[PDB]
Amino acid sequence: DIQMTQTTSSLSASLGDRVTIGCRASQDIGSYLNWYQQKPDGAVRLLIYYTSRLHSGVPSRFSGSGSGTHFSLTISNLEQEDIGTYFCHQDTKPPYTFGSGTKLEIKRADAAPTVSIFPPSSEQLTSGGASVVCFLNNFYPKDINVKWKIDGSERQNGVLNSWTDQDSKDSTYSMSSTLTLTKDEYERHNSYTCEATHKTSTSPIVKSFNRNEC
């Protein structure tokens, strides 16, 4: 089969900048190379077909180039709506093959997170479990760490971290860190603290509560 290789798996670029996404074929495929965009909700959209031809509702910012073996999709001036994963596709003849996609992120001005901490609900507690949640809202860049302290001691176990997709409108990220314990474990301690370290400040943003409600 014809192996399609994308230059990079992920790309970050500022609004207005020129962005190129590369694809390479293991054999000469002439002009039979297509580009699709997949959005986070999994929706797939043809953008460029036959190397260089724009499809339905595709902005003139998009262009395509190809040598038969090396291809690229170019965005002249990156826009907010261009976030997504871009896949190449050769369709010379069966079997059709695809590149593994290039995820395109918007590079943004740095933004400090807004941090919130959530004690377990009474509802969860009465059922025997306890989750404490730390939520870091609207920051950039994506890279961020959350340290949990229980009664002043670091806890790494039972911690689950997850990010949102980059915000389609303002390019920020949010994330939550969930610390899971039994109710009995939870009630054996008083102080619950999450510390958010981000490049926007050399000091950690600290949010805490005391189970004694004071």
Next chain:
Amino acid sequence: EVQLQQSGTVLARPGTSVKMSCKASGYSFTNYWMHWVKQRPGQGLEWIGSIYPGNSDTNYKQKFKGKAKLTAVTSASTAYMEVNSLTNEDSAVYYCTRFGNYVPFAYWGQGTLVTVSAATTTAPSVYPLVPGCSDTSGSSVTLGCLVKGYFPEPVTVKWNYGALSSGVRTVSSVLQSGFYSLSSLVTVPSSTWPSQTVICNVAHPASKTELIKRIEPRIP
């Protein structure tokens, strides 16, 4: 106008088969090749095969001969794919997509997620995320829903039945010890909450559950 409507998420045991569907509308079903494409997590896209509903001629990637079976029913304008001898490697989102004319895959289905597992369906537990008693302060409040211990994917979350969409942040699901969890948060003005019903709606298609969690102030 052209639409490809695929069937819903499926949970299937290893060794069994699944048959998924792709209802086509807005064009002449019998005059276009319908192709099927497989997307495994972090593993690109893979072409499976194609069918021409007009004469039911089929093409397959060699790999999928005897593994995937493509059919079409003209009276129903529906294309089908049956994948047998299911393994973990068959856990994927499967797309149906229309080829031609003089363009490639111009129209795509929304995808059918297949989960291959021996584990039974488990509905999520939902818990409210409410600011602590000693929290001070702001003109906006951040509220949430913790969605825990469900299987298989996906779960969708919305707020006030979809009426609340601004300031909504839903993190990606995480797989831990055989079960998924996620959380959704919303920031609303201090005069909307606790003043108004802020409900998170949690849907889990696999268990056919549609849950609500009312977000209410803590007990004083």
